[PDB]
Amino acid sequence: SDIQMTQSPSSLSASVGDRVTITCRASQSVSSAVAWYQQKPGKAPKLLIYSASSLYSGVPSRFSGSRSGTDFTLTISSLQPEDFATYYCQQYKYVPVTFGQGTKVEIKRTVAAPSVFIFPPSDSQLKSGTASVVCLLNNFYPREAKVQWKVDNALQSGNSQESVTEQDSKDSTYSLSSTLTLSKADYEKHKVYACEVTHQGLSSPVTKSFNR
Amino acid sequence: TRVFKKASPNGKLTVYLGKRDFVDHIDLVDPVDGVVLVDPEYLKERRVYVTLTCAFRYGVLGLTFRKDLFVANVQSFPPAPEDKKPLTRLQERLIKKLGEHAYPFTFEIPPNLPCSVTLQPGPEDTGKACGVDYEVKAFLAENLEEKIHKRNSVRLVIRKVQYAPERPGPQPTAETTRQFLMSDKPLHLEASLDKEIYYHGEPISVNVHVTNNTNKTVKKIKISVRQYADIVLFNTAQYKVPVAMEEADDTVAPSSTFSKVYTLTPFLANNREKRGLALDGKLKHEDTNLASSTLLREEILGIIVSYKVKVKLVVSRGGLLGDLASSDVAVELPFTLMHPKPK
Amino acid sequence: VQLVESGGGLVQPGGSLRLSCAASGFNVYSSSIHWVRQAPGKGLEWVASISSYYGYTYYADSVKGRFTISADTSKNTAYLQMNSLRAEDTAVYYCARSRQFWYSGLDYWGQGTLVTVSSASTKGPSVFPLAPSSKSTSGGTAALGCLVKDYFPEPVTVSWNSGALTSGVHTFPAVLQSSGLYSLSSVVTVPSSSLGTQTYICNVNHKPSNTKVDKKVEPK
Amino acid sequence: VYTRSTGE
Secondary structure, eight states, X not given: OOOOEEESOSSOBOOTTOOEXXXXXXXXXXXXXXXXXXXXXXXXXXXXXXXXXXXXXXXXXXXXXXXXXXXXXXXXXSOOSSOOSEEEEEEXXXXXXXXXXXXXXXXXXXXXXXXXXXXXXOHHHHHHTEEEEEEEEEEESSSOOOOEEEETTEEOOSSEEEEEOOOOTTTOOEEEEEEEEEEHHHHHSSOOOEEEEOXXXXXXXEEEEOOO | OEEEEEEOTTSSEEEEESOSEEEBXXXXXXXXXXXXXXXXXXXXXXXXXXXXXEEEEEOOOSOOEEEEEEEEEEEEESXXXXXXXXXXXXXXXXXXXXXXXXXXXXXXXXXXXXXXXXEOOOTTOOSOOOEEEEEEEEEEOSSTTSXXXXXXXXXXXXXXXXXXXXXXXXXXXXXXXXXXXXXXXEEEEEEEESOSEEOTTOOEEEEEEEEEOSSSEEEEEEEEEEEEEEEESSSOXXXXXXXXXXXXXXXXXXXXXXXXXXXXXXXXXXXXXXXXXXXXXXXXXXXXXXXXXXXXXXXXXXXXXXXXXXXXXXXXXXXXXXXXXXXXXXXXXXXXXXXXXXX | OEEEXXXXXXXXXXXXXXXXXXXXXXXXXXXXXEEEEEOTTTOOOEEEEEETTTTEEEEOTTTTTTEEEEEETTTTEEEEEEESOOGGGOEEEEEEEEESSSOOOOOEEOOOEEEEEOSSOOOOOEEEEOOOOTTTOBTTEEEEXXXXXXXXXXXXEEEEGGGTBOSSOEEOOOEEOSSSOEEEEXXXXXXXXXXXXXXXXXXXXXXXXXXXXXXXXXXX | XXXXXXXX
């Protein structure tokens, strides 16, 4: 029973100097009461444009705004190193005010493949009574990946939590940590643990398996 | 860019405007330019008029009345041969989209007219917003004598507004010396504000300096921001109502000086029981701030609002004349209160 | 001009927590103090607003009847009093600034203190090193790592050699688990030829339970 | 009673 926002872009990716556009369609007309924001990871948001198209002070000239009925837009003339964060669309005509989902604007880099390394459990963890294996990816673009563990030459799912770090500001690469969380007894039995990665840079899946 | 539009109850008539708020720069006011869309199907009276009205609305049970202060009329349809006006850029855009059927209208607001001001209603009021308001009404009839039929017409509320001057005025400062007869001893009061122009919701700093060389004692110091409203409709009316105040128990003993800075901020939340208080014009029933000070260059209709800070010293005399002769000492400081110019 | 948040911490569900943000360069009456709720990777969600000039409070429908927004106008502070906290209300709550006359959006925000709501209790991190095996070394470069697992509270800051080692380090975001305890992994890449001759450590720290860690990684 | 906007 409340107005919702629909940012159309989900994961935009572009090279430096490109003209990128982000559009958010209001469920029902919110008039020109639309604002755009920039939020760096681990930081609080900043205001860019207000009243749909009125640039805010302390914002570069490249930024600008427009309106197409329910579709409100955000356009950057030239993209810059500073301008690489997740942006948001807001409406403030009717309370409650709502935001968009977020668009992962990122740098464009040559397709580099991940360097998978598997790590066995430590003597300290296994005496604590728990078992966990870490499969690590590094220096890869794009961020998309679909790693799946295989233990005792059998696929294992539902017990593999994954985490990914933010894009590095210098070389523009990601990393990924997969963790096979299990009990100590499971580790000793059927000890053929392995992780299989699939990525665009890798023509074939590259499995890093460890025995003893 | 987008524009406002409103249709008559039966849709036969539709007004188009570019904005609701028109800025009064004193030397000139923003013109009220627009168009009126009429279909030939519903064009039977064959004369469409548009009217700009500045009216004072006033009230037992929610009933209100509108007394006109300034009325102007333009015959949009048909375009009389003895009046050809050039179209504004806003108007020529509107015809380009709508077509011939849109008939333009342009009103010029002369100077020395009142700004849109709404007087605060109480919780037991159900009528329309009382005060001074502007309004554009488009209708069609056979002639100007015919009684306009509410359904063959449409009205849209507009506002005439002002904004803070670019150049700030001189620092408001004021002095007064009260000299008593028992001895040749003066009680001196000096007061000043930080600046001349303040915005709504911003604090006002009152520097107060008292030199009490008399035998009497200052018991209390009363600071207050007071709204001056001059209402010139029939005869004359006016009132002062304190939109801020502080009663400090600061004491100035005999043969001693005192100096302190008081900071007051006028806001509406603590003035909601003061019915009749001047507020900035309301489009319909929107909550608006305390009325902005209206600036007049060189007895003007409507509600003229201004602000002053009063600094009063409550003195107890006694002695020869006892408490028959008042010994209080006050001073006043005028200042501007309005919103900054929107960029 | 600055906004400062405090009063964030772990509270059992159905409990009570209170939050306040300082205001600098903004007059209370000339501005409105909004609040927001963005959980990790979930997006901004406006929870409450206060208009000092018009004395109005606004609440989110879910929030309605639970949080109370107030403001001490003298100290220039806004106090969001949260009562009957749900586990779902775990998020980073920011305090925003708006133009009282007239609304211009959320032009300034505070950093925002962390709010956590769960039945689980604060627990110290159990750090087990990830020794660099033969698998770890490839292309002439090897990788150390420390695993921080079993701590519940979200705030944990880990720096290798007490921040002296900031090259090749990759701190993975913490993730909440079936147990509910948060688990975070941190790894670095150091040349193999330097591996062995030189020793490197991970300075894991967890302020809630006051547990400094100086565990050192040795190849397996 | 409602007043609406439109493009130009």
